[PDB]
Design a binder for these strands. Sequence first.
RNA 1: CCGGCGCGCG
Lengths: 114, 31, 54, 1040
Amino acid sequence: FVREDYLVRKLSAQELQDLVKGERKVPLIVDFYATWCGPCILMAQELEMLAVEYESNAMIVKVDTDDEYEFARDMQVRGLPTLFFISPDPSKDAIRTEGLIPLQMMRDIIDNDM
Amino acid sequence: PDAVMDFRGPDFHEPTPNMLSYLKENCKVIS
Amino acid sequence: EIEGTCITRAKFENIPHDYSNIVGIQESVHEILMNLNEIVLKSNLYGTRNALIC
Amino acid sequence: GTSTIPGFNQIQFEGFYRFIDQGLIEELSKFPKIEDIDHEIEFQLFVETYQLVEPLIKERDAVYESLTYSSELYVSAGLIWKTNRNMQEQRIFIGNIPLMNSLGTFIVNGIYRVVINQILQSPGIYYQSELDHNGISVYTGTIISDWGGRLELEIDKKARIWARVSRKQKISILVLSSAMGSNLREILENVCYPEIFLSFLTDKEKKKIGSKENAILEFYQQFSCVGGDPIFSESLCKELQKKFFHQRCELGRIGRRNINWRLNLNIPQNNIFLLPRDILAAADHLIGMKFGMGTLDDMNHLKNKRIRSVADLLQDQLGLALARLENVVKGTIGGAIRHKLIPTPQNLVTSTPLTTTYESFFGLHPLSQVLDRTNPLTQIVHGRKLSYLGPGGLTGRTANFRIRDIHPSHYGRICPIDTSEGINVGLIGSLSIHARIGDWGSLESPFYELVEKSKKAQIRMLFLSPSQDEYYMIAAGNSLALNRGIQEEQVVPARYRQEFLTIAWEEVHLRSIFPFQYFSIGASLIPFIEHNDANRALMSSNMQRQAVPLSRSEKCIVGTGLERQVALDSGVPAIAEHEGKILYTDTEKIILSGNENTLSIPLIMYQRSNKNTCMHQKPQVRRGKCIKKGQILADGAATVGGELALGKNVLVAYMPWEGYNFEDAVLISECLVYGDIYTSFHIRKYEIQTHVTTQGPERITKEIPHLEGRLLRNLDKNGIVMLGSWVETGDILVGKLTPSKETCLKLPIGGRGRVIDVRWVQKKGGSSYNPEIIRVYISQKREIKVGDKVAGRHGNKGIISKILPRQDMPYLQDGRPVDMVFNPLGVPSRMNVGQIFECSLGLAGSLLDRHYRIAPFDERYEQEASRKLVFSELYEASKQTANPWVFEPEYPGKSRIFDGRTGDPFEQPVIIGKPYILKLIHQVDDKIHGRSSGHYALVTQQPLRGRSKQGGQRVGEMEVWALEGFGVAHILQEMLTYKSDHIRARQEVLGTTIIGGTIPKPEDAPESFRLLVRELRSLALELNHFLVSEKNFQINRKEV
RNA sequence: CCGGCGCGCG
């Protein structure tokens, strides 16, 4: 009866591995964040807005670096906030963006690169 | 001066649920 | 001491009162009257001229 | 509320939810399994089967047609016919439970209602000592139960302990202790002074103590003061148990908690009854404290209080509701048994007990009040009030003078500024912004904990109850201080044991860090409040509650940042309940669609409040905009962009102007009038009811005899005023005939306006005739006028006394005339400097296109923090806009202005700016009253009372004294005989004045004196007035 | 056209 306040789902390293391995129709956007990081609040709000914009045409997930620190280091994460844009086509290569990038930049990446 | 207040910002509480919908969500009032 | 020309009275036809709406018009009667009050006119003559919006 | 300001209605929201979860079950229990005297028929409820179903009427429909928003209760019952040994279980109907709105208000009969919180003494043991006539100290310990039962333990002159129950009923401890069975042997061993108790043992008391029953009978004799020897019986104990044990011996969960603490007892929590050891343990401290052992209990301490929310008030009425149902069933089961019938369980229970006791709780209970809907600020602050009044609470005359004062336990829980004005001062409180109601009825405020190195401390924000508030060293200063030592040895002001200290940081436990911690909503909307005297802060809070929503609203240039919180928690704006996209917007609705769920949100258009203030909503989003759940969709009345907007930003000067701002008068410009800056919509409601008389029911028709067509020109065929007609004073609204005398509904004096809503509605009932109700709503556009009241947010109020053309107002060095002129003499006496700060910064913000939201007490960063903020922003506006008059290095904030009548500058520079000024409800057109003559009272025959009743003005005794001081004996007689109640002389005065032929003396007694004589006759007393002639000494009896 | 209760203004 009561809608949830947040659309971005938090996943583990294993769940993210399973999601990437499996067949994907829409672009997958992976967010690396930590609750102690100040810039991650604004990124969280921006990604909530982005998830609202892309209802079923994109998948927005977040990974906490305090729970998957080694997984984040393996994925070549050098700081926070860090975003990974994973295309549904396995042949193509993912895009890593570092910093508080604009929402329009995320829209451009999703539209013209995934 | 033309700013619209963002009620999902860090300085706001969580959105207040509908009282009837909150009662029904917790399975306290039947349809 | 400087005089100006303004709209002073507008007549509608299918309105119960100036605090109602019209179907298909985004602005209510009150907003229409407020917009009409802001029209700047120019004239060198006196008298109660009438205009038309149709 | 650990990291954000909590919802202002969260206490109401959480209390009601607690009632639904645990209040219903805890009260649906205790419902006796009803059995007849013969035990043949047993009726019982299955409380685990209880249910609530969503209301059938929508919340908008409940208020629209004057209904009550409530939900059905559908518990199941089992009736046992042992005659047939067959069980029948059905879903019976118990009643309707009112439902609280998300805003925290109920709806009964279409009226919004709010249940306010109550403060009363917490249960437990309290130690007090009062001096006698000779100054001898007399100590006292008092037991307070869960229902206010006070058991007073007192030490007399002869050291004899008496368990006082009433002002006369006095009972010794030994009789009371042996009443329950405490043998005289063990009473001595458990106290440190066995000798004291043994010294008061007369030979008469010992025999009664020796046996358990003789103590009970003697206890009954002393408690009841009834002559004779009572007989011991089971009914006697039950009669005593209800009167004494039921009201004076059940502590409750809270009462046990305090007794375990104050008397230092290791008793299990589940024991909710006053154990006999507590009484004997209390006597130990009572006698022991007389010898310097311990401290007295502080009765005004908040740790000795409890707060009763809507959860406690709704649950208690359910205790009355179900107890009222059992008496209904008992009569019903007895009635059906005498007919030897088998009644279905549904017919044994009617819905009247629950429905009526809740219908009459909101109607009659003082703690249930009509929601004030003047503006969004009044809707939320009404629900956060704390009152000592109400049932179980002290009255204004009853209230002690040490109460109404500020106690150190109030800090962070009760606002020290907000209180009611008048006889109820200090008795109606208000919750703080961050205050929370705990699980023991205690108020809690959050404090930040400072701990050592070796401690996890996952969350350092802990809510502190007043009981544990004293024993923490709480600091309010900052750590921006360093000398050649280290930071931990720097000293800061702190609170400890209800006093203020100055200790080092290393000795501080908690910090108060929230900016709005100690204030209510009203005081938290005052910018630069730290520069205003606290006396004007109370006045400023009240005035903001009287602000009228304007036909057009705008945000304040200078604020505190709490305006956005007020707008969100008031429900006036539209808040999305689902994320998605905006697809359609107009005046009547907003359409939002998200995740295959398309919703339609209607918008309120020119609706009426209980205070005759207009409600209106306008969209705040455009088509194609993505929305999060909980974000704003539209703006309501007195709300712009999601902020509270109660006023306007106007150009203002502070100077005297020819006496038209004398005392507190305000001089304004015509621009505020023809610009519609302070124009507000006001809607009145006029109701007429159709009743069935002996001669027949009232009829409504356009055809009314003895009336002109001009008066009835706005009526339709049915006899009701047409929708969208300009009515006038004396015009007709509803034409009604009573068999037939004219009993129509006419427009009162000054009510001219435009009819906007008509509601011809029938209330369906069980009679052959249904009561018809007609509601006429009339809008009135009120521009600002002479006599209207305006005020700022700093306690600066004033009446408009003069309106000038723009060419007559003083004007600035940019040529712009000002809009208001305020008297500068009102600042030094009222001591509100914060208005000077706000006007200068409001001017700077308007030139820089900036708004400012400043938290209070900004001088915690640095000295003169508000001065640096205002002066630097004034200079920035001066430099960017090339307006050197905006900031003057010679006299910052002040500038030379020119007289609009002469063009010559005023000699001294004037402080000018753009403050935020509100328009208040107190205005003319609602206060001007006149009377020539008319209707008089039925008994006293004096003119009526009240402007609405066309009544007259009262000349009281103090006004009679003044007339006697002047010696005007003929002015006084006019106001005593033929302008008030001399029936014969009132009719002659009406005649002579129309012909101008001299008024003679009344010479007879007025109807007030003749009324007194008859009343004295009713006491067998005769009062005669005699006149003795000075000519022939003949005694003449005056007719009275 | 009568009284109580609650809320306010000066």
